[PDB]
Tab-separated table of C-alpha atoms (C1' of nucleotides) in Angstrom:
chain	number	residue	atom	x	y	z
A	52	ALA	CA	0.000	0.000	0.000
A	53	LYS	CA	2.526	2.526	1.260
A	54	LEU	CA	6.204	1.807	0.677
A	55	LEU	CA	8.084	4.690	2.283
A	56	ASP	CA	11.076	2.662	3.537
A	57	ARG	CA	14.068	3.934	1.570
A	58	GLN	CA	16.662	1.344	2.617
A	59	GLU	CA	14.174	-1.486	2.288
A	60	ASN	CA	13.717	-0.199	-1.243
A	61	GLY	CA	17.493	-0.458	-1.433
A	62	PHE	CA	17.177	-4.140	-0.600
A	63	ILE	CA	14.517	-4.358	-3.287
A	64	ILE	CA	16.433	-2.313	-5.852
A	65	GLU	CA	19.605	-4.367	-5.599
A	66	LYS	CA	17.256	-7.237	-6.366
A	67	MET	CA	16.714	-5.556	-9.714
A	68	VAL	CA	20.343	-5.593	-10.842
A	69	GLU	CA	21.637	-8.626	-8.922
A	70	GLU	CA	18.618	-10.488	-10.304
A	71	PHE	CA	18.112	-8.969	-13.752
A	72	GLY	CA	21.583	-7.619	-14.452
A	73	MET	CA	21.503	-4.677	-16.833
A	74	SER	CA	22.815	-1.771	-14.695
A	75	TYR	CA	21.792	0.120	-11.594
A	76	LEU	CA	20.573	3.006	-13.751
A	77	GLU	CA	18.205	1.012	-15.921
A	78	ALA	CA	17.142	-1.235	-13.059
A	79	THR	CA	16.062	1.659	-10.886
A	80	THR	CA	14.442	3.553	-13.768
A	81	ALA	CA	12.474	0.372	-14.357
A	82	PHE	CA	11.547	0.530	-10.680
A	83	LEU	CA	10.567	4.185	-11.027
A	84	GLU	CA	8.235	3.483	-13.927
A	85	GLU	CA	6.856	0.184	-12.588
A	86	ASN	CA	5.567	2.019	-9.525
A	87	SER	CA	5.182	5.243	-11.520
A	88	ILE	CA	7.709	7.471	-9.786
A	89	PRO	CA	8.677	10.997	-10.902
A	90	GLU	CA	12.223	12.341	-10.624
A	91	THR	CA	11.822	15.223	-8.144
A	92	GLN	CA	9.794	13.409	-5.465
A	93	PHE	CA	12.191	10.435	-5.289
A	94	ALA	CA	14.182	11.240	-2.130
A	95	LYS	CA	11.133	9.906	-0.258
A	96	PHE	CA	11.221	6.571	-2.114
A	97	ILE	CA	14.848	5.800	-2.918
A	98	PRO	CA	17.620	4.770	-0.504
A	99	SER	CA	20.303	7.363	0.040
A	100	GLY	CA	22.772	4.699	-1.101
A	101	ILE	CA	21.901	3.659	-4.658
A	102	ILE	CA	22.228	7.324	-5.623
A	103	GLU	CA	25.945	7.259	-4.979
A	104	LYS	CA	26.697	4.165	-7.015
A	105	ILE	CA	24.479	5.715	-9.687
A	106	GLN	CA	26.703	8.785	-9.786
A	107	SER	CA	29.773	6.550	-9.834
A	108	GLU	CA	28.700	4.298	-12.698
A	109	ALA	CA	27.364	7.348	-14.525
A	110	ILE	CA	30.600	9.318	-14.566
A	111	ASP	CA	32.487	6.122	-15.324
A	112	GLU	CA	30.206	5.467	-18.298
A	113	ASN	CA	30.980	9.051	-19.391
A	114	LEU	CA	27.310	10.097	-19.558
A	115	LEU	CA	28.520	13.692	-19.510
A	116	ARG	CA	31.494	15.607	-20.836
A	117	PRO	CA	34.916	16.417	-19.395
A	118	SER	CA	33.183	19.529	-18.035
A	119	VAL	CA	31.782	17.257	-15.327
A	120	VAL	CA	34.866	15.055	-14.856
A	121	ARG	CA	37.039	17.570	-12.990
A	122	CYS	CA	34.145	18.091	-10.588
B	1	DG	C1'	-34.726	-1.290	-88.967
B	2	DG	C1'	-31.623	-3.517	-88.940
B	3	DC	C1'	-26.921	-2.661	-90.840
B	4	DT	C1'	-21.042	-1.558	-91.739
B	5	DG	C1'	-17.077	1.964	-91.672
B	6	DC	C1'	-14.847	5.901	-89.192
B	7	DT	C1'	-13.706	7.330	-84.782
B	8	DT	C1'	-12.074	8.806	-80.421
B	9	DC	C1'	-10.269	7.517	-76.777
B	10	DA	C1'	-8.000	4.361	-73.644
B	11	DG	C1'	-4.755	0.626	-72.327
B	12	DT	C1'	0.473	-1.149	-72.961
B	13	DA	C1'	5.992	-0.876	-73.160
B	14	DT	C1'	13.597	20.797	-55.253
B	15	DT	C1'	9.978	23.761	-54.734
B	16	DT	C1'	5.563	29.721	-54.897
B	17	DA	C1'	7.532	37.407	-55.558
B	18	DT	C1'	3.443	43.152	-52.370
B	19	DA	C1'	-1.408	44.601	-46.900
B	20	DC	C1'	-3.592	47.039	-42.632
B	21	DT	C1'	-5.934	47.605	-38.586
B	22	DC	C1'	-7.214	46.720	-35.014
B	23	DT	C1'	-9.309	43.730	-32.099
B	24	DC	C1'	-10.114	40.400	-29.669
B	25	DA	C1'	-9.157	35.885	-27.442
B	26	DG	C1'	-8.218	32.621	-25.075
B	27	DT	C1'	-3.797	29.961	-24.396
B	28	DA	C1'	0.277	28.396	-22.914
B	29	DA	C1'	4.340	29.628	-20.614
B	30	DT	C1'	5.530	31.646	-16.328
B	31	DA	C1'	6.408	33.829	-12.258
B	32	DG	C1'	3.762	33.726	-7.571
B	33	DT	C1'	3.316	30.546	-4.894
B	34	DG	C1'	3.769	27.688	0.757
B	35	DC	C1'	4.981	23.286	2.134
B	36	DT	C1'	8.148	20.132	4.419
B	37	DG	C1'	11.619	19.459	6.844
B	38	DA	C1'	15.094	20.203	8.664
B	39	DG	C1'	18.772	22.015	10.027
B	40	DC	C1'	20.621	24.859	12.267
B	41	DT	C1'	19.182	28.142	16.997
B	42	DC	C1'	18.908	28.213	21.038
B	43	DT	C1'	18.952	27.803	25.755
B	44	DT	C1'	18.403	24.198	30.003
B	45	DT	C1'	19.614	22.567	33.799
B	46	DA	C1'	21.454	18.014	35.549
C	1	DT	C1'	30.254	20.205	31.638
C	2	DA	C1'	27.192	18.764	27.867
C	3	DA	C1'	23.059	15.763	26.488
C	4	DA	C1'	18.991	17.395	25.509
C	5	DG	C1'	14.586	20.440	24.714
C	6	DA	C1'	11.636	23.790	21.439
C	7	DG	C1'	11.960	27.142	17.609
C	8	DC	C1'	14.093	30.293	13.229
C	9	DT	C1'	14.435	30.114	9.119
C	10	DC	C1'	16.304	28.420	4.733
C	11	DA	C1'	16.430	23.822	0.326
C	12	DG	C1'	12.945	21.937	-2.179
C	13	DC	C1'	8.468	20.437	-4.629
C	14	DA	C1'	3.646	23.026	-6.242
C	15	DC	C1'	-0.171	26.652	-7.904
C	16	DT	C1'	-2.648	30.170	-9.444
C	17	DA	C1'	-2.625	33.863	-11.775
C	18	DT	C1'	-0.314	36.034	-15.403
C	19	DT	C1'	1.377	38.071	-19.898
C	20	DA	C1'	3.245	38.035	-24.163
C	21	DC	C1'	1.012	36.331	-27.787
C	22	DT	C1'	-0.149	33.950	-31.350
C	23	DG	C1'	-4.465	33.223	-33.833
C	24	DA	C1'	-9.671	34.686	-36.087
C	25	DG	C1'	-12.064	38.341	-37.775
C	26	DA	C1'	-13.468	42.073	-39.648
C	27	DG	C1'	-13.181	45.860	-42.120
C	28	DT	C1'	-10.998	46.779	-47.376
C	29	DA	C1'	-14.323	50.956	-52.639
C	30	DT	C1'	-7.483	52.754	-59.459
C	31	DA	C1'	-7.349	49.093	-62.494
C	32	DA	C1'	-10.923	45.217	-66.382
C	33	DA	C1'	-4.748	42.498	-66.128
C	34	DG	C1'	2.427	21.318	-78.594
C	35	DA	C1'	8.020	15.409	-82.767
C	36	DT	C1'	5.378	6.813	-79.442
C	37	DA	C1'	3.134	3.207	-81.403
C	38	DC	C1'	-0.383	-0.445	-81.256
C	39	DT	C1'	-4.322	-2.703	-80.447
C	40	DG	C1'	-8.825	-2.521	-79.381
C	41	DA	C1'	-13.895	-1.074	-78.372
C	42	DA	C1'	-18.084	1.241	-78.152
C	43	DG	C1'	-20.266	5.266	-80.239
C	44	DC	C1'	-21.375	7.705	-84.171
C	45	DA	C1'	-22.597	7.842	-88.847
C	46	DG	C1'	-24.487	6.741	-93.464
C	47	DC	C1'	-27.453	2.642	-96.166
C	48	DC	C1'	-31.065	-0.928	-98.302
DNA sequence: GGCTGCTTCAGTATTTATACTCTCAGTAATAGTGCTGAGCTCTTTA
DNA sequence: TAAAGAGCTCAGCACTATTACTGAGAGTATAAAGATACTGAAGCAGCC
């Protein structure tokens, strides 16, 4: 009904990758759309953790330019 | 009054120069908008 | 001395009212401005 536990959702969202195995990005976007989640009201749904690995894998995949590398 | 030759048509093999005037109209973007929380503010006395 | 109140106000997602603003409309009264070829098929056309 209500699913406001962020770190529990971390346990559930690692299930996405560790189970499916595409990437943390696509796994959690799949989560966001499955339960119909916007992108500004997420801090109430998403563990504080997965965000950091998301940033990591993002910059490592080079999603943005050198303008973002130095910082 | 039924009757044959011409006939006409129909089927094959990029990139277009000069309104005007409101006048309104209702719209979609857009700033005004107020929360939530939360994080620092602050003092308390144990 | 320092764990622990109760509040002072600043990130961070909306909302209503807005403001260019683009569209729909209604006025407009000098003129006179082309080198197939073939086969075929009904219709038309003149006749005993």
